[PDB]
Amino acid sequence: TNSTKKFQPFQQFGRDVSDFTDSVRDPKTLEILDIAPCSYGGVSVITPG
Amino acid sequence: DASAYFVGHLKPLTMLVDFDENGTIIDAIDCSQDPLSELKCTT
Ligand SMILES: *[C@@H]1O[C@H](CO)[C@@H](O)[C@H](O)[C@H]1NC(C)=O
């Protein structure tokens, strides 16, 4: 997804507290993006037996 | 005219750094200089 941050010319990657890379700069068109997994939320199955 | 320069030497130390929401370094505390900064390094 489109991001909002911007950093120095000598910086390419940014990481989270858990050292997960969440910000990447596209090398062709100089824009900043954001990554997030599409596995999210909790499910629960109810069975009568 | 007359000018002056200052020269210091580097030492191996342990640093505590903090960044703001733009990644700019705004403060730094070195340990081993006084007990309060040692407490801040520990905590
Ligand atoms: C961070 O960047 C924004 C946009 O350039 C700027 O307005 C702001 O003063 C900067 N600093 C902080 C502490 O938000």
For residue B14, give the nearest of A15, A17, B38 by alpha carbon. Answer: B38
Ligand 1 mean position, distance from CA A35 (Å): 23
Q: CB-based contacts of A14: which residues, under 8 Å, 6+ apart? A: A5, A7, A21, A22, A23, A24, B23
Output the CA angle A7-A10-A11, nearest 5 degrees: 50
Structure resolution, Å: 3.1
Asked if B15 contacts B27 with a C-beta cutoff of 8 angstroms, the reply is no
Chain B residues closer than 8 Å to A7 by CB: 23
Does the beta carbon of B21 lie inside 6 Å of ligand 1?
A: yes
